[PDB]
């Protein structure tokens, strides 16, 4: 009668469930499913605190299985005494059945017992089974048991604190994923009690017969798993945060900015990556200095207090919980409140796809099958343990439900009607210490999928079956056990954003933003895999070799849960495989407990320190020798690696990183954190890359537009090409994408360039100064392009058509149809080429004229011709009036596909300047280093990326934009209203010319062509690189040989054009072409010696005759739209545009000549790019002319139109060929500045000049002012 006290300790997060008795157990599916788990019973009436325990019946069952296995391995005898087969059948008629039925194969041997076991004499196996004792099933009565396994109590709670369920357990959800489709069929919930604190259990085992001591102790040492975890058995404040978040949300509501709460919660949870200094030291962005209203997010008045100050107060109040917890819960509460008030975007909520299947409680009545399994005598049973490291080659993601929804105990239930508002924010599974965790659930699911692939045949896992599945996959997993592993890294995860672009408008869908938390790339998780069997299968070794990374393997362990965007491709490292000889060295296995919970030491020890009975496995065949690997696993996913040469700035536009980083700037490039080994820490410099989501979406859009599948009403049950090779709600994708990491990054010495844009008012001609924004993209240049080395994976099974579609998408990317990142319409992220790696892909490698000019001539010789003798004076800028006739198309041309009748291609044109060109590089204010001697002097250089001059694509795009809008009578897109005169310029202009708000009322030809808000334009411009011409303008003198000190550029006052309230807005302001830069060039000494030296600007200029070449990529244009665009680009002889700074001084007169035009289409023969002849261009221009005539009411004559004549007069260069012509254009002097009449002293007087005449003179181009 030895009372053995037993200590049970766990090494993985085990599972526990509510007890619910036995009769009441059958009512609940969760308790019936979790009969093999630990049991939780409440103590108080509040259902908050209770006691955890493990039933002695479950421990007895595990020990009985251990005895069975131990006797089977030793041929039915332990320590020399033979044991019979025991009994595992209970006859219904003779007595009651056991509360648990086996439903499992039973190990058996060849008897060998001398006599049948009876009450007088029983074998140790029969003694341990408790067959011939005084205790049965009908009643407990008392301790008549020959062997009694008492109830196992949680030893960790060694206090009277009455531990709560939340402290010990955490709810989790687990899927059953369909192998064929990749989508989960159903799921179930469970509670995971942490083994770190509450992971030890104490119980007593009372054995009366001394004949079974050795067998019982050995079985205690041999049982390995219990309650869902590996184990060894030894014989010895939120409420205040929620209220404040509600207050913040209400303040945002009264500020009418509720949609900003999502990004506010995201940013607040992002501050956890930084320190406490972002709040304590006020390191948050302060916004633009000229904004005059503070930051758009951090300066929202929360009940009379700035949001930054409110956050500081909240941190001062809640510093007890910690910075990470405070930010996390504040963001979580804000997100939950936002979801509660606003939810539902895609309405994927007719029926909740969630299914709570629990294997139907394994309910059955008429099977009771006993299946004896007798291993052959003399067979060898060995256990192979594989120890390694799971290095994440890509940022992983293991999903978990929302912490507010898990809440073990009072868990959230989807039984409520209208199961909608599915969470748009997803968290990553983490340990209780914020350590990244790879659960053995997901690892085992991935292993099962890979073994099913390797075998080539397997079953979908059936639940509640009465017979063990005998498929080859299920046989191996029944003898394969793993371990839950966490990393030694606890820093918060990066949050990665995705959007849904509306194919009709190529713009973000409203409410499509959703986020996930990803672990850093490069983390290594411990890997443990054990296989107890008679022979290591070729399929398991094939799967390990598939997972293992080598010189040319890269590892293919697709763990995690977002493999479509390339998240969770792990790689086995430091693989060491050891084996136990369970037939001859099982005492050593029991003594060492199978190295359970000590696998880290096993991985980090030499062969000389191995425990006795454990030897390395020297028969692990290589990849080239495994048959399942070569035929089934190797060709499953084929990678296509390539590098993208981006000869333009690249802006992936991280959003929240611009709200938390102290740079105080609008848009910054996306970068990610990468973990490093050997010096274990996050790498100090983040790596710039294009998201795998952006890459995947780009290819998906390309394929959908090519096939026309994009833009379908829905893909709920679609089997189109795009759904087939990119997946849908009911099927996982067959192609997986990874990040386009920047490799050519340390060859710049300034990786990111600061480019700041601004929007120019159409009427005043000056910048708005409130819409000014600055982008901060990577400094990609045509001569030094950015190299983005990415890859994607293709599943085996694509036909010729699908592989051709993928190749066509890649070819489109190479051709530059789809630029990477934001602001692609102004030359950002333009792909200049591609270089497919020649190692992996083979089929992909196998699957890859005269001058044009316009002869139109516009005379415009009314006034300047008579001035050939002594010249006249013309006011620098005139206005164009086109009336209220604005034609808006409600049937806008969308972006779903390439319409057959619509032109698409690329215009290659060259730009030559007729006057010195000024394009300031406003990245720095002292580019010329002249501010040291001259204080407050604006010094600029010509715009350049990596030290080579070029014109920004935004400049050319805006200049063509205003030219086209003035030509086609489009509305004032960038009119600046809300300005007073001393109507407020709101009612001053007609409603027709106001900017278009939405797509309902229609879009102007300019707004339809170049695009407006929530409608991407169909014309994209690129940066104009420098080719030929003199490098600079010399201007020998007191200048640094390439710079000029321009005169004062005062703000355009909108009062000269509108002297009286009755007077209306004249129209668009244009600048005449003249040689007025000569007076500035010659008066260099007399311009910086005057008063006010701070308002002058010194900047680099280059001489006339410089050649800039840029591309104008157009797409889905109408027959006449292309002609109008060509006319805008090259309006003929003696007509040029104005570009850059100093337009009123005559600087920046650029002539654009269309070097060539190309056009591509879709044909069954896969027609490539083809260049149109001169006849087609002439036809397009003519048809655009007829379209203009139709709007109004062989060689085209544009001056016949009343307003096009004025436009071409405004843009007419008089000095192109007329040597005698040289008009003088100057701004009239205010009073006594340079009189060498024409003075503001008498120009507004009614007697001198009436208002009605001066307004008319401003609207007539080239009107003399004397």
């Amino acid at each position: 009668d030895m009372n053995i006290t037993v200590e049970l300790t766990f090494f993985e997060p085990y599972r526990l469930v509510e007890w619910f008795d036995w009769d009441a157990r059958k009512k609940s599916h969760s308790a019936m499913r979790g009969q093999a788990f630990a049991q939780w019973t409440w103590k108080g009436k509040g259902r908050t605190a209770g006691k955890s325990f493990i039933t002695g019946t479950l421990v007895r069952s595990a020990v009985i299985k251990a005895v069975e296995e131990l006797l089977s391995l030793n041929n039915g005898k332990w320590e020399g005494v033979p044991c019979c087969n025991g009994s595992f059948q209970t006859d219904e008629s003779k007595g009651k059945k056991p509360s648990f039925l086996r439903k499992r194969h039973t190990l058996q041997w060849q008897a060998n017992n001398k006599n049948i076991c009876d009450k007088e004499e029983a074998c140790p196996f029969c003694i341990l089974l408790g067959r011939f004792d005084n205790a049965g099933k009908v009643h407990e009565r008392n301790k008549d048991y020959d062997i009694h396994f008492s109830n196992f109590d949680l030893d960790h709670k060694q206090e009277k604190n009455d531990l709560r369920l939340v402290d010990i357990a955490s709810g989790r959800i687990l899927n059953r994923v369909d192998f064929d489709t990749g989508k989960a069929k159903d799921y179930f919930r469970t509670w995971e009690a942490d083994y770190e604190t509450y992971g030890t259990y104490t119980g007593r085992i009372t054995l009366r017969n001394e004949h079974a001591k050795k067998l019982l102790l050995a079985s205690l040492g041999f049982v390995d798993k219990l309650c869902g975890a590996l184990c060894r058995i030894e014989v010895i404040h939120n409420d205040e945060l929620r209220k404040q978040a509600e207050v913040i949300v209400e303040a945002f509501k009264q500020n009418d900015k509720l949609e900003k709460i999502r990004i506010l919660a995201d940013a607040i949870r992002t501050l956890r990556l930084h320190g406490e200094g972002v709040i304590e030291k006020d390191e948050l962005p302060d916004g633009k200095e000229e904004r005059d209203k503070g930051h758009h997010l951090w300066d929202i008045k929360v009940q009379g207090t700035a949001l930054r100050t409110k956050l500081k107060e909240l941190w001062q109040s809640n510093k007890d919980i910690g910075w990470r917890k405070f930010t996390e819960m504040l963001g979580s509460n804000l997100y939950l409140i936002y979801k509660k008030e606003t939810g539902g975007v895609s309405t994927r909520f007719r029926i909740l796809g969630d299914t709570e299947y629990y294997s139907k409680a394994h309910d059955s009545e008429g099977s009771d099958l006993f299946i004896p399994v007798t291993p052959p005598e003399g067979i060898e049973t060995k256990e192979w343990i594989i120890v390694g490291r799971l290095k994440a080659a890509t940022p992983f993601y293991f999903g978990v439900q929302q912490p507010s929804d898990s809440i073990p105990g009072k868990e959230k239930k989807s039984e409520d009607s209208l199961v909608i508002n599915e969470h748009t924010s997803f968290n990553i599974l983490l340990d209780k210490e914020n350590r990244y965790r790879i659960p053995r659930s997901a690892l085992r699911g991935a292993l099962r999928r890979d073994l099913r692939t390797a075998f080539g045949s397997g079953c979908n896992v059936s639940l509640g079956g009465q017979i063990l599945c005998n498929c080859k996959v299920c046989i191996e997993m029944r003898r394969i056990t793993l371990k839950d592993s966490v990393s030694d890294f606890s820093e918060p995860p990066e949050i990665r954003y995705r959007i849904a672009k509306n194919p009709g408008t190529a713009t973000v869908e409203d409410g499509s933003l959703f986020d996930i938390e990803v672990g850093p790339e490069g983390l290594t998780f411990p890997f443990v895999l054990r296989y107890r069997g008679h022979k290591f299968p070729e399929q398991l070794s094939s799967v390990i070799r598939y997972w293992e990374e080598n010189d040319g393997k890269n590892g293919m362990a697709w763990l995690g849960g977002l493999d479509s965007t390339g998240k969770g491709r792990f790689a086995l490292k430091d693989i060491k495989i050891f084996e136990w000889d369970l037939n001859q060295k099982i005492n050593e296995y029991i003594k060492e407990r199978g190295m359970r919970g000590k696998e880290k030491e096993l991985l980090e020890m030499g062969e000389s320190s191995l425990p006795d009975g454990l030897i390395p496995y020297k028969f692990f065949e290589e990849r080239e020798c495994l048959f399942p690997y070569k035929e089934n696993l190797k060709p499953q996913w084929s990678e296509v690696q390539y590098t993208i040469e981006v000869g333009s700035p690249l802006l992936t536009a991280d959003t929240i990183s611009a709200l938390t980083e102290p740079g105080n700037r609008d848009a910054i490039a996306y970068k990610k954190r990468v973990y490093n080994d050997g010096n274990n820490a996050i790498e100090p410099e983040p790596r710039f890359a294009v998201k795998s989501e952006t890459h995947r979406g780009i290819f998906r859009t390309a394929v959908g537009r090519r096939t026309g599948d994009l833009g379908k009403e829905d893909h709920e049950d679609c089997t189109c090409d795009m759904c087939i090779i990119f997946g849908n709600e009911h099927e996982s994708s067959k192609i997986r994408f990874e990040d386009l990491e920047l490799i050519n990054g340390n060859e710049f010495e300034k990786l990111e360039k600061h480019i700041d844009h601004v929007a120019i008012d159409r009427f005043t001609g000056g910048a708005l100064d409130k819409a000014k924004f600055d982008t901060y993209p990577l400094a990609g240049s045509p001569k030094k392009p950015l190299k983005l080395k990415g890859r994607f994976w293709i599943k085996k099974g694509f036909s010729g058509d699908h592989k051709l579609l993928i190749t066509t998408a890649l070819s489109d990317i190479r051709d530059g149809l789809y630029p990477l990142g934001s602001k692609g319409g102004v030359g950002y992220g333009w792909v200049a080429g591609i270089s497919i790696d020649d190692n992996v892909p083979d089929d992909f490698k196998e699957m890859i004229n005269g001058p044009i000019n316009n002869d139109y001539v516009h005379p415009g010789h009314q006034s300047p011709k008579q001035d050939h003798k002594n010249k006249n004076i013309y006011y620098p800028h005139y206005f164009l009036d086109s009336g209220s006739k604005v034609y808006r198309e409600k049937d806008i041309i969308t972006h779903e596909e390439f319409t057959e009748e619509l032109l698409s291609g690329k215009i290659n044109c060259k730009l030559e300047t007729l006057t010195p060109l000024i394009i300031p590089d406003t990245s720095d204010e002292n580019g010329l280093k002249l501010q040291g001697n001259k204080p407050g002097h604006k010094n600029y250089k010509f715009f350049n990326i990596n030290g080579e001059l070029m014109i920004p694509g935004s400049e050319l795009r805006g200049m063509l934009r205003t030219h086209f809008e003035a030509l086609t009578k489009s509305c004032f897109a960038i009119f600046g209203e809300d300005s007073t005169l001393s109507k407020t310029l709101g009612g001053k202009l007609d409603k027709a010319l106001h900017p278009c708000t939405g797509l309902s009322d229609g879009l102007c030809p300019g707004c339809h062509l170049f695009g407006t808000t929530d409608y991407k334009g169909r014309v994209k411009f690129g940066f104009a690189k420098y080719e030929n011409g003199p490098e600079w303008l010399i201007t020998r003198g007191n200048n640094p040989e390439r710079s000029l000190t321009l005169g004062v550029l005062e703000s355009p006052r909108p009062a000269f054009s509108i002297p009286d309230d009755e007077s209306e807005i004249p129209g668009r302001k244009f600048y005449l072409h003249h040689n007025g830069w000569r007076i500035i060039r010659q008066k260099q000494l007399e311009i910086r010696e005057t008063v006010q030296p701070e308002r002058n600007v010194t900047t680099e200029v280059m001489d006339k005759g410089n050649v800039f070449s840029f591309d104008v990529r157009f797409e889905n244009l109408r027959e006449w739209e292309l002609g109008l665009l060509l006319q805008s680009l090259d309006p003929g002889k003696n007509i040029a545009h104005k570009l850059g700074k100093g337009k009123p001084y005559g600087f920046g007169s650029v002539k654009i000549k269309i070097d060539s035009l190309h056009t591509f289409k879709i044909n069954s023969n896969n027609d490539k790019i083809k260049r149109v002849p001169q006849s087609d261009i002439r036809e397009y221009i003519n048809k655009g002319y007829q379209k203009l005539i139709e709007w109004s009411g062989v060689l085209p004559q544009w001056h016949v139109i009343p307003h096009i004549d004025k436009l071409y007069k405004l843009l007419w260069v008089p000095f192109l060929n007329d040597s005698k012509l040289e008009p003088d254009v100057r701004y009239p002097v205010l009073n006594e500045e340079s009189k060498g009449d024409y003075t503001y002293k008498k120009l507004g007087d009614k007697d001198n000049l009436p208002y009605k005449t001066r307004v008319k003179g401003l609207t007539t181009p080239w009107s003399p002012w004397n």
Binding site: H105, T347, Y357, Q466
Partner: protein
Amino acid sequence: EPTREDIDRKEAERLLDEAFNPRTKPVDRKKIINSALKILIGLYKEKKDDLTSASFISIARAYYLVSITILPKGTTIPEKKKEALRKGIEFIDRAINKFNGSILDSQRAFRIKSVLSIEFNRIDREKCDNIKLKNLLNEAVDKGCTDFDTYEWDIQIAIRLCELGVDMEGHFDNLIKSNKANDLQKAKAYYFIKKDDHKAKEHMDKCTASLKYTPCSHRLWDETVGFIERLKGDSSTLWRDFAIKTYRSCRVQEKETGTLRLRWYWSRHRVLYDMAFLAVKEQADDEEPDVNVKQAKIKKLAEISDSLKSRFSLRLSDMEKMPKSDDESNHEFKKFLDKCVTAYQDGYVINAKLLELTQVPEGWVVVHFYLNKLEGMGNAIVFDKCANSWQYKEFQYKELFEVFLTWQANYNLYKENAAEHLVTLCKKIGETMPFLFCDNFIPNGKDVLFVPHDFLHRLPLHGSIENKTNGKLFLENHSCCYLPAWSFASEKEASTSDEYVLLKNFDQGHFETLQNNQIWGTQSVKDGASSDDLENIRNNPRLLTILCHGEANMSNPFRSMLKLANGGITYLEILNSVKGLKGSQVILGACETDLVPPLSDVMDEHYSVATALLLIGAAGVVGTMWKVRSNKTKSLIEWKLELNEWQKETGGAAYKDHPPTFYRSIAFRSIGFP
């Protein structure tokens, strides 16, 4: 003065009515319901408690229609259908609790709730018990669910109440005179209200006759079989003929379609066939002076057994299936699946030569096996052509199934070393089927054909051992040839060539003597052969040998394949592409049968690739049942003289001394009938 809520509800109701048109395609119906339910939910988003009752009625109707548009993926009711019905029940509960006061709205609400609840009880008994449904139906009929002339749902309510033992005496005349009453519904009313057996029988004969033209996926099939089950449970005498009539209707319906021999799974087909078999067997247990009627009854029993054993399984495999491939093959699947799904949804939306059983050559005796779960005990029907007589015997298969499962579990781990369990299984077969060794049941020296039922396909019936102290092997006295069903038998009228073909794609190191040192020379043989080589056989030879370990699909028998090169040839590709094997003996050695089918769970409708060879015209397939060492099948192939005579002397009768020798000799069986 309509509002936005009223006009949106009207639009949703119009969409629901359009989706309630029986002419609507099932694929468009799903999108229509999604649109209507999206509208209704959008209204409910703003009026969680202020929503009008009629909108709640529309939501409940839409959820009911969602539930009826969800088909069972497998052999169990999907949880999505239950969830849809539950959501509709909750919405209609909120409709009822918000007492609008309108009598018509209350009647409509209770009708919708009762319909949802009867369907929910039909698919889930536990959550919607009989007592709760009875109380709800009583409340509905109290509320005014009496008009059977306009609403078929009210007729459904009345019939469901009749099924629940509730007195519908008052409404019987209205139910009968209603033009929308179904034939089965009228029969149930006659049997339950008036208890008029004669009228019910003569009126349900019409329903059974009309069932011929309705696909088995229709609701009326399930309801009819459930009515037969209820009649059998009530011990009514009407079920005996009803089961036979419905079985005949099922034969007529099944024979109309299915050129590739597949049927629709509806979970009551097996119950229907079991009841028909039991009814015919009970009719065969009467005292008739003439034996002709008894012989006809036993022949009918064999017909019932054979008609069930020649079709296939669940629908998720039908959806997945294979791409276009053969234009003839894919068209049949598309038509069958479309018509079956359309019939299933319409049920709820208003509204070569086949040899006869007696065509057996002289000197041959055939045995038909049938296991019915309702009776729970097996049947063996034998036909002796020489005596031209039919007789049947009974046996129990529960312990036999347990022993077979034991052998299967042991084999899947210790293949060669599990011979003792094979001997135990053979002894169990001999003990549980003593009629196989009875002279009266099977005459001595007769060539026996076996048509095994589901898990008896896996039993070595030729290797059964008689239950005697010195029991003789069944193989020693009779020549056994197996066959999945009698309908697979054909006539050996094909022309046999003079060449032998030896395909091979097995792993290197085996069969090297056969390939290089061709014993019979071979003409169009190959090494590392692909599916194209099998498809390129033009002249049908006397012997085609295929040596490639195949694979199985646990769900779709059409996807079981022989692992030849270029992806291997699958079960369906054999039917479409292979043509040149008319009357060709096959010694297919694809590393045992077990590779090609899944592992059984007393349901083995899965058919190996051998029956595909039988379908394409092969005269016989001499395969292997369980994996054996390669020299055994090599010696079988080298046995070129033209099976039990080989097994008798090779060592097949040596189970007493060397079970391993018995293991690898009994593994060979001949599939096909001369």
